[PDB]
Design a protein around this nucleic acid. Sequence first.
RNA 1: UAGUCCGGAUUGGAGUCUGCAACUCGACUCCAUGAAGUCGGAAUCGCUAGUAAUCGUGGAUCAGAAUGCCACGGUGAAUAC
RNA 2: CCGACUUACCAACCCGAUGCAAACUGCGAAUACCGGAGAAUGUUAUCACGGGAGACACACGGCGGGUGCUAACGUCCGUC
RNA 3: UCCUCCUAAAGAGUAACGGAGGAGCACGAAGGUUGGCUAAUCCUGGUCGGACAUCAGGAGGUUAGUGCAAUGGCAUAAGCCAGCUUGACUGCGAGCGUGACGGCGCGAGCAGGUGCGAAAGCAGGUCAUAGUGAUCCGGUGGUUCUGAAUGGAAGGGCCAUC
RNA 4: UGCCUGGCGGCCGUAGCGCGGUGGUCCCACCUGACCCCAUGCCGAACUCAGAAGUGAAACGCCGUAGCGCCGAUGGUAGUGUGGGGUCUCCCCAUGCGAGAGUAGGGAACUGCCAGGCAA
RNA 5: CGCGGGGUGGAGCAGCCUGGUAGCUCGUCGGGCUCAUAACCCGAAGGUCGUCGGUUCAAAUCCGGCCCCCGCAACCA
Lengths: 116, 66, 136, 50, 75, 177
Amino acid sequence: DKKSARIRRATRARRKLQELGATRLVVHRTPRHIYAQVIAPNGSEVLVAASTVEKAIAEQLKYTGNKDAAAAVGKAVAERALEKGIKDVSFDRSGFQYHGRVQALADAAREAGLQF
Amino acid sequence: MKKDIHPKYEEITASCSCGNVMKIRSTVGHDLNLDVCSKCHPFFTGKQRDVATGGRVDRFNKRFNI
Amino acid sequence: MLQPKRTKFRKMHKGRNRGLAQGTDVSFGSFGLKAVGRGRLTARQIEAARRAMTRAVKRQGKIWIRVFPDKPITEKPLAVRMGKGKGNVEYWVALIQPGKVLYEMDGVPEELAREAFKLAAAKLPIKTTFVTKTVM
Amino acid sequence: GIREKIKLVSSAGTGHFYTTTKNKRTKPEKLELKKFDPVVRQHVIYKEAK
Amino acid sequence: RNGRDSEAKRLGVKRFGGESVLAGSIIVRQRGTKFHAGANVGCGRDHTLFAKADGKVKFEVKGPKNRKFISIEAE
Amino acid sequence: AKLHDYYKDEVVKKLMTEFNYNSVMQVPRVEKITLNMGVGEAIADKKLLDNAAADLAAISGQKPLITKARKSVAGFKIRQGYPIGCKVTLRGERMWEFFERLITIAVPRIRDFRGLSAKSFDGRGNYSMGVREQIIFPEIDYDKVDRVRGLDITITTTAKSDEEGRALLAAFDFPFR
RNA sequence: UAGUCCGGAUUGGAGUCUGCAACUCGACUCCAUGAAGUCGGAAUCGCUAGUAAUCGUGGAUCAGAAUGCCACGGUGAAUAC
RNA sequence: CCGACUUACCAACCCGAUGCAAACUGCGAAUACCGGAGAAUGUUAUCACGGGAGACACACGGCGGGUGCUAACGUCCGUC
RNA sequence: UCCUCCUAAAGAGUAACGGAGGAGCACGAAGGUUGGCUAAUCCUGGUCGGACAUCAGGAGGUUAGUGCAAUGGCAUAAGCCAGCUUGACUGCGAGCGUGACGGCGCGAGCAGGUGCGAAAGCAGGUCAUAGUGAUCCGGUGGUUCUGAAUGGAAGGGCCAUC
RNA sequence: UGCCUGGCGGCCGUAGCGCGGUGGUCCCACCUGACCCCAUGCCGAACUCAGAAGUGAAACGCCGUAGCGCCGAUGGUAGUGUGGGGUCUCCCCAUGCGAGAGUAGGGAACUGCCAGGCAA
RNA sequence: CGCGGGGUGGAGCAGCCUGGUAGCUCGUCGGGCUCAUAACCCGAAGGUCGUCGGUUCAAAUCCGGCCCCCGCAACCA
Ligand SMILES: [Mg+2]
Ligand SMILES: [Mg+2]
Ligand SMILES: [Mg+2]
Ligand SMILES: [Mg+2]
Ligand SMILES: [Mg+2]
Ligand SMILES: [Mg+2]
Ligand SMILES: [Mg+2]
Ligand SMILES: [Mg+2]
Ligand SMILES: [Mg+2]
Ligand SMILES: [Mg+2]
Ligand SMILES: [Mg+2]
Ligand SMILES: [Mg+2]
Ligand SMILES: [Mg+2]
Ligand SMILES: [Mg+2]
Ligand SMILES: [Mg+2]
Ligand SMILES: [Mg+2]
Ligand SMILES: [Mg+2]
Ligand SMILES: [Mg+2]
Ligand SMILES: [Mg+2]
Ligand SMILES: [Mg+2]
Ligand SMILES: [Mg+2]
Ligand SMILES: [Mg+2]
Ligand SMILES: [Mg+2]
Ligand SMILES: [Mg+2]
Ligand SMILES: [Mg+2]
Ligand SMILES: [Mg+2]
Ligand SMILES: [Mg+2]
Ligand SMILES: [Mg+2]
Ligand SMILES: [Mg+2]
Ligand SMILES: [Zn+2]
């Protein structure tokens, strides 16, 4: 399956990340609505979560399924995570090839101040 | 597709001897001259001559003549 | 003689014969020859106790052999000193524990089967008994 | 067996060398490994020697 | 024909559950990966699980395949 | 893609009335088309496979993938990882151009053509025919080849049975003796 | 200069003649098919002149049925120290 | 050639039923061993360093086994 | 002599001319990292093509594979393919395992410098366990450390190495 | 506050398959197209980008059904530490421990942080 | 019981060490030569590699069991 094949590709970087005890930025991509959220090292709860499904972000976009929309997410997460004080995080691709929207989300987060 | 590894794929003019000009993309070259298209191939009459051909009594009655 | 077609290993340990058997109930037939005494039956004895069992109840009836040797027993040649390795496998025994149904019979009268299992018991070393298939 | 042992000589000024093996009868090219030369202390392109 | 054997490698679990270890101390000297690297426990090239921190050993049975793990609670 | 529009408009509704699908997407559609030319005889002549990879470039409009031997079998004298065959998986818009060129001018030109076979299904919905001559296609100029090297075309659909996959390919007129 | 417009076997179909009768088992014809075979291993035969070679014809036998046999003429050699 | 039916027979794989295994395990003791805490008890019975050694032919009984013939006051190990 | 399983009695170890099998290497890539992928065998269909070449789908499910014998292990793959590469690196190394000892093995982390990756990170060989011999003697390159009156040198020492 | 959906987990077969029904306002998946980012040791399948007419067939989620998988007592039995006994190649007795299989039955999960849609 | 070698067309022997392809001489079969045979010349066929299993892509070969044959050994009182 297309969905399950993606989960095994994520497992490599998920399991390695919790032994290190890092706060990972889990980014979920979809043909529409690129998601994103920061999860604590405990692996249970999120601390900061921002995506295009929020009306606060979608209403300032042309379409919530592309690069400039993905650039809008990364800035939003990196500016509200710098509100809770979460500075040094890790970037978890969630099995997605770091090239398009998953790349644009990091580029928007790297410039904001989100250290990774 | 990967550029510069596949052959030239350009539209050509194909026309059988039944007025059926059909334009299609290929890798032949400039044009094409067809023999029999799908709308002129004798398949609609193909089954007719091999199935209904037998019989020996009818053959023999052209010999008895009465 | 009942012998295993190509087992994994040629020779194997002696091993103790402690415990009680599992194949205790008469399953296929209706009458059985349960083994009371502990011991070991060679492939010669099982085969011999069958001929003189498949003679008393003629060509009729069906006899089940609930035992199979599958245990090689070594035997050193005469005039050979101890040591120098394991001997040569000569015969195959079947470790028989108390309560192991040796044979089962079906398709015959009970009194006939009572007398057929008397002929086979005299060909086996272990003390046996005559049991009947019980309703659960 | 066939895998003889040679000496990777540093192309730097010093005569430091990493010794190792190489199958001569199957591989006709020489080794050009970039290894750490503890005298110059950078990373020099070593070359095969005997 | 026979008469050959190896030298016993002294494998097995050195430190057991609840036993206080030190950093670098070998918890399990194993062949394959019977036990896995849990928390604060590394894995060498010999598949030898060592303790990367002071504390106590804690065997667990996590994972979707019930495979054994070895963690370390700082004690 | 001339007959691709033929599918999107006529073929779909033509099947909707025959099996009363409760979805427009439930209609069968041909997924891809594979052109296998498993030469095999390349153990003797290395340039034999090289020539075979050229004819797939003519029959189809793209480069073939020279496949390697999955397992070494001495009955045929081949080894693990030895180039034995060449395939072409064409889809997208370039399959319909081939799908058209196949059943419009190539199939009719088959030597001793009486008809195809209606039993050549794998009980799932895939059709797999085989051509004997490669000269039935326009590209092979007959004076540039030296082999009767033919191939076999596999047509993969999105059907769920051969009973239904036959209905999809029926709309394309397929001779079918 | 190719297994080819070479070669003509084999086979299918349709026909004719003689004859009570053409399946076993005839000859010829038309269309189709069109293989072996690219000068032949050891070995061996005929012949000195109008012979050899090559071409075609006729007759006997015979209802029909020869590349056989008998006979005729056309072209026409080489070599014999 | 295709290729159908049939058979005094043997039988692959699955399914139900039945046993076996030191070099089989979808299960799994009792003990033994490692670590922590606690009381009682024991002339510290404990560990380390130093002086001196002897000893490195073992035997029998129980239990757990290899070998032998589940033979040997047999032979070789574990443990008492 | 070394490696794997059993013997071995659920820590380790444990004998016999007890039972079963292998090694005296291979690789510059079969190593490192990054990205991606995941089987064997049958069933159905298909040009030459056949019990078994290549192709498509299903079933099945790791019965596959793992440079090599066996056992433990593996999809988070350690199995398979591809891009860039040399960490198959120098000086160390708390702390442990294993042995009478010689010796063998594991190792986070520290500094120099390097590779891959966007980054987190990972790399001082290879899924692990065999592929190997002490000392002496002597050879080879480097390093003023010494160099028997003094300045050099021979010869020793130290490092690498045969 | 409740039904829904997506993400990251806890726990990891009482938690997984089989069969049937069912969901599209959101979401999800499928899907449309490909100058360009990138891409296939052939191929927009996958990976990627730009979007979004249509669909809920496929996929996934959810509810029922136990046809299987699975979980599983009490009791008994097997075994066994220690001390005794015997017809001592094997058992028995006293005390402590107590399986595996099988049976009654349980059973098609339970739950937390966040972010939306929704009736309020 | 032990050590070492062998088993290959109808006969006698190569090939096995260092796996994918089996050859020599005689005999047999067919033709020729001769009045006929032998000899001589030309052409061709003929092998489950003892047997069963395993290793492997592939076994005559590499490994193991069994059957047959050959040589050596079967000793000190
Ligand atoms: Mg030994
Ligand atoms: Mg061992
Ligand atoms: Mg003609
Ligand atoms: Mg010819
Ligand atoms: Mg004369
Ligand atoms: Mg069960
Ligand atoms: Mg023990
Ligand atoms: Mg204690
Ligand atoms: Mg205490
Ligand atoms: Mg001694
Ligand atoms: Mg001694
Ligand atoms: Mg004893
Ligand atoms: Mg004794
Ligand atoms: Mg002793
Ligand atoms: Mg030693
Ligand atoms: Mg042990
Ligand atoms: Mg490797
Ligand atoms: Mg990976
Ligand atoms: Mg077929
Ligand atoms: Mg096939
Ligand atoms: Mg690797
Ligand atoms: Mg290895
Ligand atoms: Mg010496
Ligand atoms: Mg001086
Ligand atoms: Mg659905
Ligand atoms: Mg109980
Ligand atoms: Mg006894
Ligand atoms: Mg139970
Ligand atoms: Mg003669
Ligand atoms: Zn036409």
